[PDB]
Amino acid sequence: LFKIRMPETVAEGTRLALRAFSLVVAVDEHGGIGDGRSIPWNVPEDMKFFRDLTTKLRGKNVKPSPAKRNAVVMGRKTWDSIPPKFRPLPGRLNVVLSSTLTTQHLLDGLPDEEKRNLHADSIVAVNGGLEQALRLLASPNYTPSIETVYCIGGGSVYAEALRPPCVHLLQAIYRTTIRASESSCSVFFRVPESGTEAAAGIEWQRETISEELTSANGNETKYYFEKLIPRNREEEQYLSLVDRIIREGNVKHDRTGVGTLSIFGAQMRFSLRNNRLPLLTTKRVFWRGVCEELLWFLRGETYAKKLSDKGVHIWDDNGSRAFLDSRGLTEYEEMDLGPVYGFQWRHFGAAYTHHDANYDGQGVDQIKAIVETLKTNPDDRRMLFTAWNPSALPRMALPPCHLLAQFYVSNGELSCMLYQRSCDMGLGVPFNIASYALLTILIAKATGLRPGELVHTLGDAHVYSNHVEPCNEQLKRVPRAFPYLVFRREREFLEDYEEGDMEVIDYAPYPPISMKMAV
Amino acid sequence: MSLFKIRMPETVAEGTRLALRAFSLVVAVDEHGGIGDGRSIPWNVPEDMKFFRDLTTKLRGKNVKPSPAKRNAVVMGRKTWDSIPPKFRPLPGRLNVVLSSTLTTQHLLDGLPDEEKRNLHADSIVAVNGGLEQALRLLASPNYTPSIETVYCIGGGSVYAEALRPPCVHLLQAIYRTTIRASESSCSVFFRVPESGTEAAAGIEWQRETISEELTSANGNETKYYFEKLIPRNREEEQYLSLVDRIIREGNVKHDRTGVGTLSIFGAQMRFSLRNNRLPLLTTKRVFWRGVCEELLWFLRGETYAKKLSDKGVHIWDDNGSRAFLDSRGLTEYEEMDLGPVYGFQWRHFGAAYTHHDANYDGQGVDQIKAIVETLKTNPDDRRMLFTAWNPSALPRMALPPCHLLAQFYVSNGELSCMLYQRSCDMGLGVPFNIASYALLTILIAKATGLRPGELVHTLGDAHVYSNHVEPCNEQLKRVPRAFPYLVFRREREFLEDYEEGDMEVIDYAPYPPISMKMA
């Protein structure tokens, strides 16, 4: 009665259409890959690179299991090129594209039966092209069990990977160039050039390129590596702003001695279409905290212990007996933050006593109101909620930072604008971009709409002084493609969603910033 | 109300006093840029002389002849004044300001042919012991501003040079240059407009608003000549025009329940400088400043009775205050024009229970404006200095929810900046109005807190162009924005709530004329 009931279209608006993937290829100085899939210029260093890349999982501790492993999609001819005795490629799900062969067919091609069953799990045939394979890998059985998908070969498989719609799911291209001169490469590999129609809006850029290396295979073969990624202009908005703040921001010092460089007034835009999730890649975002806290906000929770008991300690400091008493909130039990955030969202203006009270039906439930409006009159220009309540600020452990959000609808897509008065560019902003992206996605799922864009307006945007050096280190990283968000299951009510109901896939953030802590 | 009211500080006027008055420049050059072989001018092109005469003499809005209460001023070097035949001195219908380090105003008078002439022109002549800068400073005084409509620098290689470099060049609103094809007339002093991107231009980008076709003088040598009007590119107004254009070309079309159509985009942001008295009133379409000012003052006093506005000829709330509209909102108990706890009420009495507009609300609710004013004076770096009228609890009781619903302040180097959040923005008439309102508010708050006006950042939520405004808006998009006007205060007050529209004046506002055709 007080909860928000999810429509029957709850799962259809965010169903992953195609799984994201990477492409791995070896070419010669002329762009040629080979004829019917040749390899006579076999460079042991490349084979090992290929093996490590496609087999290893990110979790530097995890070993490939049917529950968590990488996938390799290949054309039939590529599968045939593999010595029958060495099929399938171990430690990976072998997805073979074929319009004649079948899963059993591929299986029997393998000699001994001891493995004709030990690998019955590691092989699957797809009657179609790359797109169908990615569509299949997008199903519950493979996503998220499959950590990363690698398109490994076939001139026709690469060509489909490099054109729409598949290219929009291409996270990276790993190209090895063997400087061996052979003409036995009837087909060439071409990465769409920046700004051309074939590129379909994507700007391919090298993240890395090695120096010229020499093989230890006797031929002294010259070869080098390249990692190409689709330029992420959205994350560059955030980096450009950080750099501008450090270069031109005003330095200020807290009454406690804390310093910051800052600018006033900025705005950034992020797409939420097709399951895209704007989790910054140049520095890992604590997604689990983001998700737990957001759900916490939606349920109009005010007791920080619920978050603390989940390993999310972002409210510890402002939830202690000391801090609370410093605010004159002596009757508040520790971790009881008062009518903050989510409380104003679901109960704007409701009198607060203790987090223990039952606030059902109290105050103005702005979220419920926006949900109903979105479903009946999406063009309404008053669809916004705020936590900024001058009358309740004194009763809060702390005044809200992200205090206002407005929704907008166009062509069945739901867009959201968030206003944040104070923005810690280092830790907070990436976190908050994630929260509202998640919020927008959930609201879309509650209103029969598709997630659109997240607009982020910043007031006082700052970088802490003793964050400058580590921030400069991060500013050196070229943003990678964003990950995607999928839901394992749905719920009857919005307030019933749990962090375990959704999963973030294909998130490959850069390593932690080496903030030389000592030594 | 005294303690209920906001007392202004002793520096109230200090950081708002006009330092230098804006001005235009008119000059004639030969095909090489030379203005004169030294001090003389071997070319008397009749048509140029007339243009100069008309341009510097006329006022805006025809049918208004110059008078000591409203006229333009011409600023010239001493040698230029001397080049004028004593009989035509001073140039009629204009305040003649002469730069001289040796001649006083009386000395200038003594130079007129007779006494009668001196008494008749004593009020139209003034000497200033200094350069153009000192003249612009004097012209910024209460005696001359707003009295003098437009200031025109009219000559002297020395005066032009000073006009074209900082600090004076930042007050130059337009350059009117006449180019004449002089034959073998090699001069010495060259008039050159600083190129875009050069150190000399000081960040200003001079562009042609207009350029005439090549003309032929009726004089004796049929001298060829042409005119140009150059203005400092206004990137700030271009923000607005670019957004409008993008909305028309790419916005989403929508029609409400009434059948009212709009094109819209979601999420935008613009910036406007308020430094050194600059007021961002759009020039490509005249803005109703008196209405902006009366309403803003009305907001600040925490008013809710629209009749106070309509009685002053400001009818922007008539439709939303009518018995019929109030009743459509279920506000049947409200007196007509009593809007309920809207805007200013929430600004000065957030959360207070509302009955009627004539009730006494002193001390009730949270006075957000007063709190911010105090914080700005003692802890300017605080990051919680913002006020809002978006009160979900009171919305049902309002004639309608607020459009500009939140504003945050920021301080840097003694400069006050303000960010405004507007959920719904009518680009055609509403946005220019709003930009001016918050520019005014920021300036007033700056004056009440011992700070200098800084920047106004405007965040737009749903930004739309009405379907009925498309064609006219397209006409407006043709126009190249002109330099913005300025705001000056003719008097100060003891309290913020005491300010009246007549205490301030917009000067040097030169908007384009109404857009051709009607119906929409």
Ligand SMILES: CC1(C)N=C(N)N=C(N)N1c1ccc(Cl)cc1
């Ligand atoms: C080892 C090789 C040639 N090298 C790269 N860079 N990429 C591939 N996809 N390869 C490849 C791997 C397996 C198969 Cl079956 C075919 C080609």
Ligand SMILES: CC1(C)N=C(N)N=C(N)N1c1ccc(Cl)cc1
């Ligand atoms: C008429 C003339 C030559 N023409 C232009 N364009 N500008 C001036 N400033 N002029 C001018 C006017 C008066 C004086 Cl005393 C000197 C020059």
